[PDB]
């Protein structure tokens, strides 16, 4: 209907993530909902999340939808009036949006310390989180070089290099097949994530997993920068266990937590063993 | 009650673990009407020592039934309070059951829960109501910690089984067999590969249960497992206990199977309930284990037995391990009534409850 | 896991003296992260114990329960229904017939159309006109009546299977009356029940204010 129009118009901010826009659309449609019962609202918003992930096939949209449903259930467990409960839901959603829209800056502030002077950083594709981290690092009078792969499916590496050149940072574009070649000249690898699975692994661009192995074979540190709304309760046993709704040439793949050193979220610097703890404490 | 002394010569590495015999029994040193121990308690101890009850859930359920009967047939003496009297009375029973056979993790957790329940009984409340409350608490524990937990684990594991899969199981586990039968009943079409090992050969308990359900099953011994793994899709293993460090304590042929499965890129799945989680840790299969009857290793091969008189050789000693410890790096996930968690989430579940 | 959360559990209480009249369903406060999936038809939560959960949006409910599944939510209360919304034929007469009791039909002394008012149950009943009335806003305080009406014509214990069997009976009645199946989706089962009962009433009317309202359509 018109929910897709609003969701696609909310993505006029180039810095706004897809999951953030989906959550904003869900909150707007919860505000404008004329329902008088909690079950009808839950069902309508569930079908709306279904439509949203039908429009955008990213894992972040599904993660945000599940987080919104869990927040709805948590707010409904308390008051049980659906009027005062609705006001509480509205104010809590406002506060949650205001707190989650500034998580990238906090991630950058807490992650930019791990970058030394004169080190070499390896990135896979274009991501706003790595860009903000590198900007916060170069703002602290740090000097380093950046290697970025081209990400052949959609040339996001050239876009990342063009965005980094405006920051006066030496950047070099390498091919996807030359990952194992420049791995010895890189001091650390920093990648983003589209979704963090239960065990601790990530779900990212197709050329990420093969880069986490080549780093593990050389004891290179491998850091993942991702927000908190990307925590999804999924457990892929292998590359085939990933749902086809997210992969569709595959557009995404899974990386095991044993190849990940640290995660930098708005909750802080965590190990791959903390995502499962957070998901269990949330009772999603 | 006298102590059960060790039979045979023990290994220099397992010198701190008691080794008993199946023929040895303490009943010959007790009364026919039991005086110090309860009749249900000595019956349970004899059934444990003779090997009639060996399954983890089965052993724990039998222990809880015996405890229910003991609490029912127990009356408090004057000047005494039930809260302390019952706990102080149950200690010799547990020590005798341990001397019969080393207690498992489920039995330890059940004993701890029962002690916590008996200590929590009020002082001014009556006894005729306290015994009924304890019986109802034990019944609710059995209902919500074993049955509903197994149902939830089967429901969580059903979504991980696909059509055309080749599942590999080991030994005899109630949860694994229940999951396989429920998955076959729901509509999943696959085949199972049953792996067995000497001397118990309890894998046949699962095989004959999968044929009666109509599931295509294969049978082979453990040393040939590396031959069948290239065609295996997933490995379902049962666990007796999940240690606080993430290690999995199970049958002696579990860690080896998980190690060989890693070399063939086969995901290893472990199934266990949250009531078997232990706060203790363990780094190897040497600090704590169980030494079974060494006479079980004697096999009838041809027309003579090579180990018929192994005790005559002073340097010859037989080793019969029952348990094994698998490190967390060889386990992919654990299916509990809370869902599918990583092998690093064991303390979290221990901290929530 | 999030699709398993509930808000009110339908306490299926099927006592057996007469299954067509005194079988009732009352909702109690039970969130408790229910084990099975939950389906919401019209503000009513049903646990998918026998059937499974299905995704996507299809034409009718038969398209869902032919594979052995049920949609997450479908009906007039959903903004994005899993089934295609459709209007109906004789809702006006079923609403205008909401002022008479069944004693008004039995005092007339004819059993011809009283037969026609026995399709969904077999016992002479007319509460479908009270359900399909204009005043009857489908919100709270009305789940019990609808669920009891569904259970009374379901011949089962699992509410989802009773819903499926009621829809199958609706389709069988439409086929027996020579009507189409595309005119009867799974969108609003009560309105289709009322339309079928009113059509049978119109068909049986010539064998006889009530007569005027019945013959007002031809």
Swiss-Prot record, chain A:
Listed InterPro entries: eIF2B_alpha/beta/delta, elF-2B_alpha_N, IF-2B-related, IF_2B-like_C, NagB/RpiA_transferase-like
One Gene Ontology cellular component annotation held by this UniProt entry: eukaryotic translation initiation factor 2B complex
Keyword ATP-binding: no
Subcellular location: Cytoplasm, Cytosol
Protein name: Translation initiation factor eIF2B subunit alpha
Gene for this chain: EIF2B1
The family this protein is said to belong to: Belongs to the eIF-2B alpha/beta/delta subunits family.
Residues bearing PTM N6-acetyllysine: 31
Pfam entry (one): IF-2B
UniProt keywords, alphabetically: Acetylation, Cytoplasm, Disease variant, Initiation factor, Leukodystrophy, Protein biosynthesis
Role: Acts as a component of the translation initiation factor 2B (eIF2B) complex, which catalyzes the exchange of GDP for GTP on eukaryotic initiation factor 2 (eIF2) gamma subunit. Its guanine nucleotide exchange factor activity is repressed when bound to eIF2 complex phosphorylated on the alpha subunit, thereby limiting the amount of methionyl-initiator methionine tRNA available to the ribosome and consequently global translation is repressed.
Swiss-Prot record, chain B:
GO terms of biological process kind: cytoplasmic translational initiation; myelination; oligodendrocyte development; ovarian follicle development; regulation of translation; response to glucose; response to heat; response to peptide hormone
Primary location recorded for the protein, binned into one broad class: cytoplasm
Keywords: Acetylation, Cytoplasm, Disease variant, Initiation factor, Leukodystrophy, Phosphoprotein, Protein biosynthesis
SS bond list: none
Stretches for region May bind the chemical integrated stress response (ISR) inhibitor ISRIB: 4-13
Activity regulation annotation text: Activated by the chemical integrated stress response (ISR) inhibitor ISRIB which stimulates guanine nucleotide exchange factor activity for both phosphorylated and unphosphorylated eIF2.
Claim: Ion transport is one of the keywords in the record: no
Molecular function as annotated in GO: guanyl-nucleotide exchange factor activity; translation initiation factor activity; translation initiation factor binding
Cellular component terms (Gene Ontology): cytoplasm; cytosol; eukaryotic translation initiation factor 2B complex
Cellular location(s): Cytoplasm, Cytosol
Origin superkingdom: Eukaryota
Protein biosynthesis recorded as keyword: yes
Subunit structure: Component of the translation initiation factor 2B (eIF2B) complex which is a heterodecamer of two sets of five different subunits: alpha, beta, gamma, delta and epsilon. Subunits alpha, beta and delta comprise a regulatory subcomplex and subunits epsilon and gamma comprise a catalytic subcomplex. Within the complex, the hexameric regulatory complex resides at the center, with the two heterodimeric catalytic subcomplexes bound on opposite sides.
Role according to the record: Acts as a component of the translation initiation factor 2B (eIF2B) complex, which catalyzes the exchange of GDP for GTP on eukaryotic initiation factor 2 (eIF2) gamma subunit. Its guanine nucleotide exchange factor activity is repressed when bound to eIF2 complex phosphorylated on the alpha subunit, thereby limiting the amount of methionyl-initiator methionine tRNA available to the ribosome and consequently global translation is repressed.
Originating species: Homo sapiens
Residues of the full protein shown: 167 to 519 of 523
From Swiss-Prot, chain C:
Lineage: Viruses, Riboviria, Orthornavirae, Negarnaviricota, Polyploviricotina
Residues of the full protein shown: 7 to 232 of 267
Entry similarity comment: Belongs to the phlebovirus NS-S protein family.
Gene: NSS
Signal peptide, first to last residue: none
Domain of life: Viruses
Name assigned to this protein: Non-structural protein NS-S
Coiled coil location: none
């Amino acid at each position: 209907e018109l929910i897709e129009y609003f969701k696609s118009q909310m993505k006029e901010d180039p810095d706004m993530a897809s999951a953030v826009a989906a959550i904003r659309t869900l909150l707007e449609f919860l505000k404008r909902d004329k329902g008088e019962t909690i079950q009808g609202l839950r069902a309508n918003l569930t079908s709306a999340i279904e439509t949203l992930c039908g429009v955008d096939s990213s894992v972040a949209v599904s993660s945000g939808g599940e987080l919104f449903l869990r927040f709805i259930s948590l707010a409904s467990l308390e008051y049980s009036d659906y009027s005062k409960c609705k006001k509480i839901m509205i104010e809590r959603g406002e506060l949650f949006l205001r707190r989650i829209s500034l998580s990238r800056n906090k991630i950058a502030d807490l992650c930019h310390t791990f970058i030394k002077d004169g080190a070499t950083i390896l990135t896979h594709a274009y991501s706003r989180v790595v860009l903000r981290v590198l900007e916060a690092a170069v703002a602290a009078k740090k000097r380093f070089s950046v290697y970025v792969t081209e990400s052949q499916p959609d040339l996001s590496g050239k876009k990342m290099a063009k965005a980094l050149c405006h920051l006066n940072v030496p950047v070099t574009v390498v091919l996807d097949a030359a990952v194992g070649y420049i791995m010895e000249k890189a001091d650390l690898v920093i990648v983003g994530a589209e979704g963090v699975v239960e065990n601790g692994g990530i779900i990212n661009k197709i050329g990420t997993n093969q880069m986490a192995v080549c780093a593990k074979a050389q004891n290179k540190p491998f850091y993942v920068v991702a927000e908190s709304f990307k925590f999804v309760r999924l457990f892929p046993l292998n590359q085939q266990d990933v749902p086809d709704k997210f992969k569709y040439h595959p557009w995404v793949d899974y990386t095991a937590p044993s190849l990940i050193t640290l995660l930098f979220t708005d909750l802080g610097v965590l190990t791959p063993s903390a995502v499962s703890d957070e998901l269990i404490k949330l009772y999603l | 009650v006298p102590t059960r002394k060790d039979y045979g010569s023990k290994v220099s590495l397992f010198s701190h673990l008691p080794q008993y015999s199946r023929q040895n029994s303490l009943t010959q040193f007790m009364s026919i009407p039991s005086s110090v121990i309860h009749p249900a308690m000595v019956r349970l101890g004899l059934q444990y020592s003779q090997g009639l009850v060996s399954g983890s859930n089965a052993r724990c359920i039998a222990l809880l039934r015996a405890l229910q009967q003991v609490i029912q047939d127990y009356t408090t003496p004057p000047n005494e309070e039930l809260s302390r009297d019952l706990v102080n009375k149950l200690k010799p029973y547990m020590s005798f059951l341990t001397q019969c056979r080393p207690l498992s993790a489920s039995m330890h957790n059940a004993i701890k829960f029962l002690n916590k329940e008996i200590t929590s009984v009020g002082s001014s409340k009556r006894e005729e109501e306290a015994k009924s409350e304890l019986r109802a608490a034990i019944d609710r524990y059995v209902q919500e910690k074993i049955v509903l937990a197994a149902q939830a684990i089967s429901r969580f594991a059903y979504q991980k089984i696909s059509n055309g899969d080749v599942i590999l199981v080991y030994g005899c586990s109630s949860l694994v067999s229940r999951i396989l039968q429920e998955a076959w009943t729901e509509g999943r079409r696959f085949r199972v590969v049953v792996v067995d090992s000497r001397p118990w050969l309890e894998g046949r308990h699962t095989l004959r249960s999968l044929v009666h359900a109509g599931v295509p099953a294969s049978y082979l011994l453990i040393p040939a497992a590396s031959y069948v793994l290239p065609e295996v899709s997933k490995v379902l293993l049962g666990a007796h206990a999940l240690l606080a460090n993430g290690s999995v304590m199970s049958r002696v042929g579990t860690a080896q199977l998980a190690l060989v499965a890693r070399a063939h890129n086969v995901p290893v799945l472990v199934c266990c309930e949250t009531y078997k989680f232990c706060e203790r840790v363990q780094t190897d299969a040497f600090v704590s284990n169980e030494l079974d009857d060494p006479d079980d290793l004697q096999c009838k091969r041809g027309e003579h037995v090579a180990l018929a008189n192994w005790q005559n050789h002073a340097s010859l000693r037989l080793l019969n391990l029952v348990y094994d410890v698998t490190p967390p790096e060889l386990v992919d996930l654990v299916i509990t009534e809370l869902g599918m968690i990583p092998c690093s989430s064991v303390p979290v579940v221990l901290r929530v409850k | 896991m999030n699709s398993q959360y509930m808000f009110d559990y339908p306490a299926i209480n099927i006592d057996v003296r007469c299954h067509r009249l005194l079988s009732s369903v009352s909702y109690v406060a039970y969130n408790k992260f229910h084990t099975h999936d939950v389906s919401t038809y019209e503000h009513c939560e049903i646990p998918l114990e026998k059937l499974r959960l299905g995704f996507g949006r299809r034409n009718s409910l038969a398209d869902f329960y032919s594979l052995g599944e049920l949609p997450a939510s479908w009906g007039p209360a959903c903004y994005f229904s899993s089934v295609k919304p459709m209007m109906y034929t004789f809702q006006g007469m079923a609403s205008d017939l909401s002022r008479f009791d069944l004693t008004s039909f039995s005092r007339k002394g004819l059993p011809n159309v009283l037969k026609a008012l026995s399709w969904p149950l077999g016992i002479p009943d007319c509460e479908i006109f009270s359900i399909c009335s204009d005043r009857f806003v489908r919100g709270l305080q009305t789940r019990d009546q609808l669920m009891s009406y569904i259970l009374r014509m379901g011949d089962s214990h699992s509410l989802d299977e009773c819903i499926v069997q009621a829809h199958k009976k609706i389709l069988q009645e439409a086929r027996r009356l020579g009507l189409s199946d595309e005119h009867y989706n799974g969108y609003d089962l009560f309105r289709e029940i009322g339309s079928l009962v009113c059509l049978r009433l119109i068909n049986a009317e010539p064998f006889d204010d009530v007569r005027t309202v019945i013959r007002s359509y031809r």
